[PDB]
Design a binder for this molecule. Sequence first.
Ligand SMILES: CC(=O)Nc1ccccc1C(=O)O
Ligand SMILES: [K+]
Ligand SMILES: [K+]
Length: 274
Amino acid sequence: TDTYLHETLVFDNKLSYIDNQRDTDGPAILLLPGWCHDHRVYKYLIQELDADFRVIVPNWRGHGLSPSEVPDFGYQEQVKDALEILDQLGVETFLPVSHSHGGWVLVELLEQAGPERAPRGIIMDWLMWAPKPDFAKSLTLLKDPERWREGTHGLFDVWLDGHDEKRVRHHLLEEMADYGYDCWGRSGRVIEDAYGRNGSPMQMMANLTKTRPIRHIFSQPTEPEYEKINSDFAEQHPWFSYAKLGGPTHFPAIDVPDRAAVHIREFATAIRQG
Ligand SMILES: CC(=O)Nc1ccccc1C(=O)O
Ligand SMILES: [K+]
Ligand SMILES: [K+]
């Protein structure tokens, strides 16, 4: 719970982070938040993992229980932040697990840390193809100082997908309520730039200097054409796999924390046998 919350100076910035400080065999589980939310998204997943793993959740610049305005930064800076926390903490070997566009951090972290330190990754509910019209419009709305809130509302609609999902509604409407345009507009510029510059998550992962096992676990998009791009990518890359989780929303970490946990334990166990 909030018993594991700390704060430290990371270069210029005071960042909060979760660390259960569990004294156990590696690798540490590094749970990466997406944009404009914090460690609260992972409270149910931390419960699944707490007794068996050391679990660390960094919050990005301007993120946390008290969001704040900060200067412009991108996934590159998120990566330098994540590693500085891990260096301060004395963590060597880690398994990164990302929420959605936290994936840009995860894949760049894999490159930077290398396959000894970061031998595998798990990406959760991360749009594998380049932006379809509806999502591209969302990003344009987030970037708009007059329409960013409309932006979030449309994304909350897609994310909930017609479900009265109490815990996820709580996360979106309460736990993300204090994030403003400084975050949401940034999230729009960063994600748009990331696709523009890397093509896609699939292309970025394929382009790793050292490819290594990555699994995509997702609940949405729910249509067959999305499963198919995942299966086609998996057919093509030995190191890639996926699992459709069947959860109601964009936040499997919240709505199917037990399922997310068994995939993370599978990967952790594989690394230990290693
Ligand atoms: C927490 C979260 O999902 N954040 C995002 C914020 C803006 C745009 C997209 C996303 C996403 O990660 O899907
Ligand atoms: K319900
Ligand atoms: K495969």
